[model samples]
Target: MAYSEKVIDHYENPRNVGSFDNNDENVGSGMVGAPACGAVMKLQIKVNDEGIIEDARFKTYGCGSAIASSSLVTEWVKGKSLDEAQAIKNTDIAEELELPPVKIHCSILAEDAIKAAIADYKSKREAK
Candidate 1:
């Protein structure tokens, strides 16, 4: 099975590949894992007081598609509104990236990571 060209590009030169300063009050962090596959993903977003996403970052351990998916979303969510980011779908990501059928779950993982991070940020804001 050969990977798609986009997957190769993303894996070779992934975007926003590191973690942000999660301890910072302005940053929201989320970590998720799939025990069945031993897949783990960590995502972070820097949100402004107005709930705008200024930046996104992620670290994922899985297949090339998983890394590509997470890297893709990190780029997509930057400068987007929190609600817009929340609206992102794994299908959309997979479609845009043209992922193969077997790699679809990687896109789902990326979408989940984004939602989890945004939810964390929103919850923290609500507590304030």
Candidate 2:
């Protein structure tokens, strides 16, 4: 399937394509694997004391769609509060990317990654 321009743009120039120290208290890490395609994605977020997402990053080993999905979400999540970032849905990502049915899982993975990262951050706060 041909990718939409948005998808192509994100795939070609992925944003926040790196890693943060998972060990850092301010950073939360999320990792998910897609059993359907053996795709694995790791998403990270740095939250400020005010509970706003100050930064986001991701690394994915998968198709272009998966990479684009993760890349787009990082940009979307930055500057958003954890609650706001968690509100983002797979359908929104899919629609933005014009993802085909087969590639829709990529968007779902991205959504899950965001939730996982937020959960990680919340758990860390609870532990403190």
Candidate 3:
């Protein structure tokens, strides 16, 4: 199967491909896996005191689509308010990447990663 140009672009040069210190009070981390595909994704975010996401990073171990999906969301979530980031849908990521039906779950994983990260951040704040 062939990938879209956007997928190729992102897969070739994934952005924000790294990790953040999950122990940091300002950082939130999320991890998800697709058992069917044996894909694993870890997404992290740094939020400001005002609850705006200042940065995002991800590490994906999967197919090209999975890697591209994670990479794309890291860019999208940066500088966005937590609410804005939460509003992001898998459909949007799929459209942006022109993902095929079989690869659409990759986009879903990306969206889940964002939600998971935001949830983790909220929990951290509430615990303080």
Report the alpha-carbon TM-score of model 2 versus the true structure.
Answer: 0.78
Predict model 1's lDDT versus the native: 0.74
Q: Model 2, range 1-128, lDDT digits (tens) per residue?
A: 23322222244876545776335787878888755556667778899899999888877555443367788888999889989988999999998887778657867888888888898888887987
Candidate 2 lDDT score at position 82: 89
Worst 10 residues of 3 by lDDT: 1-10
Candidate 3: segments with Cα more than 4 A from true spot: 1-17, 63-66
For residues 1-128, what per-residue lDDT tens digits would candidate 1 score against the true structure? 33322232245776545766344577777777664435667777899988798877766555533367777888998999888988998889888778777646767877888888887887776777
Q: What's the CA RMSD for each of the models? A: 7.0, 7.3, 7.1
Cα lDDT, model 3, residue 79: 92
| Model with the higher lDDT, candidate 1 or 2 | 2
**TM-score per candidate, chains pooled:** 0.75, 0.78, 0.78
Once model 2 is optimally superposed onto the true structure by TM-score, how far is the C-alpha of residue 58 displaced, in angstroms? 1.3
For each candidate, the alpha-carbon lDDT, in order, equals 0.74, 0.77, 0.77
Write the residue-wise lDDT of candidate 3 on 71-118 in tens digits.
Answer: 788899999998999999999999988877775787788888888888
Model 3, backbone clash pairs (residues 3+ apart or across chains), number = 0
> After best superposition, candidate 3 residue 11: deviation in angstroms?
16
